[PDB]
Ligand binder design. Structure first.
Ligand SMILES: Nc1ccc2c(c1)c(-c1ccccc1)[n+](CCCCCCc1cn(CCNc3c4c(nc5ccccc35)CCCC4)nn1)c1cc(N)ccc21
Ligand SMILES: Nc1ccc2c(c1)c(-c1ccccc1)[n+](CCCCCCc1cn(CCNc3c4c(nc5ccccc35)CCCC4)nn1)c1cc(N)ccc21
Lengths: 533, 537
């Protein structure tokens, strides 16, 4: 029995497993319960802390993935399957995983806590792209990820009710955060040095933790990759959630809130997932049925209100986007798009595609979008029309909300660093026209190209190393710059005056100004005034 | 008759004229200045359509420019060449309907292509006698017959009670048409070809050329057209019948005229010319720049529908147009109403002065539209930078009034069978007295088209002299053939037609012709396609 793989946490003894990383061994503790399984009468309810256990809990293995929709658009295809559950689905899924160096760190080590994306309807901390072994081995980081409930199970809300208050998936994350505070020292983590990081919905989740006071004493720094609490998709109003929850009930035979919720709780999990999409108010892409709600509790006002009025002086934030935020979403509903062909679209297809990417837009607002995104020298050119449709979706959903947050945090005293990620993986299975799609930086940050068997290029393995350094340096210090590297160029902070950001690609850091400033002026300043009237 | 130059005696429908041998650098030219083409539109004829000049006995002396039509005289900068050069340089009179003819000397043995100039000045000012409109150079160097007319401006030209007998509107355009009919009947006496007549004009002159293109009775009087920095469509060149009624009535009220149209017009008639000029500007509905009180009216007669509708549905297969703009259409308008702007300092404005400037530059915008304008013109990297704000103000005014209205004239005419040629003029005169920040202001290419730099005593650079010769060649090549390109000249780069598919136009500067694509395509899609729709809802 290996003494390095035996840990005593607050609720009992754990046994981890030594994993092999290319440069040496790592200690992994997989599938640690941090909450009472949210099953039966606990469905839709806030999580409760996990009861103590006897003897030694087996923590050598990933545990169930929270019950969620499984993608079937391209069955067998790697570009989609890599996001699909890789363990058994179950409502019994409140488990976290910890990777540490081997042997366990000698002194307290910065902790990085990963929160997965998946539109708040999917994701798992067990996916191959979130593998913590590389960051633990190379940078000596303690890396943590938690499963948290998604779709109806994490976010179905009848706001104001006791038994479905909304946001329980965010409370799952928060409980994992407290678990880290209480237990990470046992693993050689420094609970005084926790950095959240996340992508897509995970990034929005990180942002929500920023904007919720009870979460604020559970971390120091945050990294938001391709997502934000503000923006069109990450939240819904109380009114809208009540509507969706009510409508879902109606669609599954149910039936006051109590009666309604009790009958929802009698329903098989797959019955809820079956009808999950039918509650969206409009035909759309980049919209999700069950997402955090503005409840006046976890979130005391809209993310927009909270970012305009917050005090962020104590905060360090790393934010960024990938080069092609919207391209991969187009094949999930926009007529004319497929991964299997070059998706050259007509102008008609372009206006039509816009009403789906900007579901809330009036005829005028949509016209405004089309006019601002048309290339007036070749208005009919099908490659630009395709690329523009992709940029409409990316800008509206990710880039401009990010610019807005970077914002914003900078204006209210936060230290902010921003990037755009422009390297396309040589191993990528989506077609070339999609460029560098939403989600495709993650493998680089986690250090997957260091696994010689995945055959990334040599250049990409160097690049992954640089990225792991920025992230862990940032975790360590709140500054992504290498504090011993006296040869340039430096990653400067994002400020509202200079709006400086960096491109992460194969070439050395390039400093740029304005994160599509002109385009985001439209989306953040003009579009809202236009929908108003 | 017989002691004077036998080569300066010509007869026209109205009688005998004596003109004058003028000196140009290359040699002599014949000029016939001050030829009456209409009965003086004075007295009971104020606001009425012009009546054809009645024949005279004896030899009319045609050796000097004649009266300028009654108009506002600029005073913002006394003694300053930049404003004075546009001010009247003969006496102000309602009796002002005269035209001018420059021909080679001796007059051409064979019928020569005719160029007809129509001056600009917002429809409230202008004169065919200004130094910058001097025909001698085109006449001498290009062998051109150049004709230019006075037409009535301000109230006298454009004050209208639409539907009435006594003030039908558009009479200043009718003055211009009467001069065109005069060229048809008489220009052969000077050795001009009435079957080869080109109109050309800048600013309001260009809009006038455009109205002639759009008005059927005018279409038989000329044969191509050149519009410099002006269009008949756009926010300033016309007014609805309703709005013209409103302005006439308000001005009537401001000069103490009180209720049908006959009394009202009779009382206006009545008023001293100077009193009308004194109150002209007071009828504008909002605080504004690039708006003028009395302009062509959509009467359902001269203009059968709005210019916008006429260019969308007209057939233009037989038409050849040269159109274009200068680099800085709006800059010189800013000193005439936008707080913060002056000719005597750098005009570095604040962000507040910009939002305030937009409401004046786009007087018709709701709050929403003005916000769109600001958003589209702010540089979001440096949103408070006073140089950019200054230059954006200029661009807003220039884009909205000239560049983008030109941009469709070109597009619509080309979509509908015209042969169109397009230019942006980018050379700043070395002699210019406006400040540097104003760049190449509205009106400042005319000088070069007319060949003024060929006058050695004017202090233009040698390259400017070559430059003017080129432009003159382009313009007269176009008059001559409908094609600015030199047929003979294999070497020199070619000026392609403007098409909807390729949107080609040329830079006119000291460098050889460079072909560019899309005339502010991205920005003009805002003003011509989006702004209107925003202004509805
Ligand atoms: N006929 C039906 C019935 C039910 C559902 C349907 C369709 C669909 C659907 C399938 C194909 C086309 C349109 C719609 N859907 C799917 C719509 C979801 C579309 C989002 C897919 C997407 C695409 N991307 C960008 C590229 N990278 C990723 C992904 C995926 N996940 C992630 C997660 C994190 C980061 C990146 C990433 C998953 C899919 C592929 C690419 N992110 N997310 C359902 C979903 C439900 N929750 C419930 C029911 C149904
Ligand atoms: N207090 C008063 C009283 C009466 C009038 C006043 C002001 C003004 C005014 C003057 C200064 C500032 C604001 C308003 N105005 C306004 C006149 C100013 C508007 C036009 C100025 C302008 C500026 N540009 C651009 C530069 N190039 C030119 C010009 C001018 N003319 C031309 C004509 C053709 C081509 C070019 C060109 C004239 C002046 C300066 C430059 N063109 N025109 C009046 C007008 C009237 N018809 C009657 C009365 C009054």
């Amino acid at each position: 029995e290996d003494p390095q793989l035996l840990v005593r946490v607050r609720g009992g003894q754990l046994r981890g497993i030594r994993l092999k990383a290319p440069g040496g061994p790592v200690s992994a503790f997989l599938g640690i319960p941090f909450a009472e399984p949210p099953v039966g009468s606990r469905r839709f309810m806030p999580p409760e802390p996990k009861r103590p256990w006897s003897g030694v809990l087996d923590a050598t293995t990933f545990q169930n993935v929270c019950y969620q929709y499984v993608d079937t658009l391209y069955p067998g295809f790697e570009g989609t399957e890599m996001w699909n559950p890789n363990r058994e689905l179950s409502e019994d899924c409140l488990y976290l995983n910890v990777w540490t160096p081997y042997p366990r760190p000698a002194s307290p080590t910065p902790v990085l806590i990963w929160i997965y994306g998946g539109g708040f309807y999917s994701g798992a901390a067990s996916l191959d792209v979130y593998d913590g072994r590389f960051l633990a081995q190379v940078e000596g980081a303690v890396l943590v990820s938690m499963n948290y409930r998604v779709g109806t199970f994490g976010f179905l809300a009848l706001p104001g009710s006791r038994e479905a208050p909304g946001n329980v998936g965010l409370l799952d994350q928060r409980l994992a955060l407290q678990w880290v505070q209480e237990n990470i020292a046992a693993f050689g983590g420094d609970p005084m040095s926790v950095t959240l990081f996340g992508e897509s919905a995970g990034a929005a989740s990180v942002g929500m933790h920023i904007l919720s006071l009870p979460s604020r004493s559970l971390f120091h720094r945050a990294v938001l990759q391709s997502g934000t609490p503000n923006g069109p998709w990450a939240t819904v109003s109380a009114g809208e959630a009540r509507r969706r929850a009510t409508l879902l009930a109606r669609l599954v035979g149910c039936p006051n809130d109590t009666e309604l919720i009790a009958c929802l709780r009698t329903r098989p999990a797959q019955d809820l997932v079956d009808h999950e999409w039918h509650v969206l108010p409009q035909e759309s892409i980049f919209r999700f049925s069950f997402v955090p709600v503005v409840d006046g509790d976890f979130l005391s006002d809209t993310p927009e209100a909270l970012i305009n009025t917050g005090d962020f002086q104590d905060l360090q934030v790393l934010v960024g986007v990938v080069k092609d935020e919207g391209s991969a979403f187009l094949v999930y509903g926009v007529p004319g798009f497929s991964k299997d062909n070059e998706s050259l679209i007509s102008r008609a297809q372009f206006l039509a595609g816009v009403r789906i990417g900007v579901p809330q837009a009036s005829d005028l607002a949509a016209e405004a979008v089309v006019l601002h995104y048309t290339d007036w020298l070749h208005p009919e050119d099908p490659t630009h029309l395709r690329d523009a449709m992709s940029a409409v979706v990316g800008d509206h959903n990710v880039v401009c909300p990010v610019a807005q947050l970077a914002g914003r945090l900078a204006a209210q005293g936060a230290r902010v660093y921003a990037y755009i990620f422009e390297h396309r993986a040589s191993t990528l299975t989506w077609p070339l026209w999609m460029g560098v799609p939403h989600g495709y930086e993650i493998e680089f940050i986690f250090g997957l190209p260091l696994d010689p068997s995945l055959n990334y290029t040599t250049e990409e393995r160097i690049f992954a190393q640089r990225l792991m350094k920025y992230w862990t340096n940032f975790a360590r210090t709140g500054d992504p710059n290498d504090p011993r590297d006296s040869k340039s160029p430096q990653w400067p902070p994002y400020t509202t005056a200079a709006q400086q950001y960096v491109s992460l690609n194969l070439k050395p850091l390039e400093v740029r100004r304005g994160l599509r400033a002109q385009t985001c002026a439209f989306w953040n300043r003009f579009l809202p005034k236009l929908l108003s009237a």
